[PDB]
Symmetry: D2
Subunit: 115 residues, 4 copies
């Protein structure tokens, strides 16, 4: 698939399991339209969000529900969520892997983009 | 100073200078209301965004224009911008330092919350 | 395998390919003994460093040659290398995944430990 | 102050206080020579490690006792310690800020190198 997200937990040293996230695409009228959504598996991965045909050129936002994740573990975290906003497929189709590391008061994200 | 942002550059090993950001507060209708804004100084710091009187409880969004930063350095960035979204003062007013570290395909942010 | 390392490049948004690393184990005399070594593949992964039988309880050090990596790309980085030092298998055999993200002046590492 | 270290805690959203570290300089025989040491203050900072006269070109290692830090908080950590190894002053004397962010299974460090 052309878009997948993997989430790790820096407190437990484990994948971050059952983490919900919503993907949006920027529309012509500059609003965010719902594009896809899912949650991470027991390996902390979310696959199959979209397809090569559906995943057209555009600006995308992945909003990761880190707050509910920490809350379910008894932690009151700093962030409401973690976002990743990027232009995709500008120079042709690419595959995107979004990696996120979660702590109660911190997060890191990086992107691996391949042809 | 109840809210301070500090931005570092992971490619050049320096403060990230002249980085523009806007701070929003979530309104009752769930849209983002402009609240404050500024550019990081030569030390990568942005101060005096708000005061303790004005900085009431609510959900705040700091949107950092990382894309313009990398473009000025002649480097192609992944993200459109970096966001930090958080609930402020849920236990009564505190002081917030938001630290962000920027790379072209990655960013890390952490909060320091003091009394 | 019980120990694998994956390395990403935060400047290129890609795996960090052909990154050399050496693993050492702490000996009885408190010296570092060579344990295994390898380099990352085109997916930025290094597998097959060791086996369940060989990978006994101990303190291990993974020393990642980040300097040569950046140098080969024309960058003079801050760090000589990135280390990860940890006690392994203290409560019984585990599988360790070491993830590292590289920038010229920064690095991040996290560990995923599973049974 | 030519060398300063600042440590943050990603679980508690605070400076990491009373974190002990030692700084070493590589000797001609490739062993690590004690050079300086201290504990982070209430602001997570450690200053006055060295002076511009004494801080000559060489390879320096800052070894941060992250393990003792987490143990005192009652939290099981992955790493034995965190290291930062770097060549200093290769273009003539500069000022170094080493920033480290600590989680139980992860750490991030970045350098700010100023003139
Ligand atoms: C989160 C990460 C990866 C590691 C620590 C870090 C950072 C970006 C910015 C800053 C960080 O910690 C130090 C902090 C800081 C710098 C100067 C200062 O005077 C006070 C501070 O609290 C700024 O990236
Ligand atoms: C620590 C930080 C900042 C955030 C997560 C991260 C990383 C560097 C490398 C990897 C990271 O998480 C995903 C991980 C990974 C990638 C592919 C895969 O198949 C399995 C994995 O565990 C690799 O940097």
């Amino acid at each position: 698939c052309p878009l997948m997200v993997k989430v790790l937990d820096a407190v437990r040293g484990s994948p971050a399991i059952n983490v919900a996230m919503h993907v949006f695409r920027k529309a012509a009228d500059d609003t965010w339209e719902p594009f896809a959504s899912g949650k991470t598996s027991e390996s902390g991965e979310l696959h199959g969000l979209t397809t090569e045909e559906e995943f057209v050129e555009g600006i995308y936002k992945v909003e990761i529900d880190t707050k509910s994740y920490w809350k379910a573990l008894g932690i009151s975290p700093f962030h409401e969520h973690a976002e990743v906003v990027f232009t995709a497929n500008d120079s042709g189709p690419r595959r995107y892997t979004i990696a996120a590391l979660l702590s109660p008061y911190s997060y890191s994200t990086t992107a691996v983009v391949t042809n």
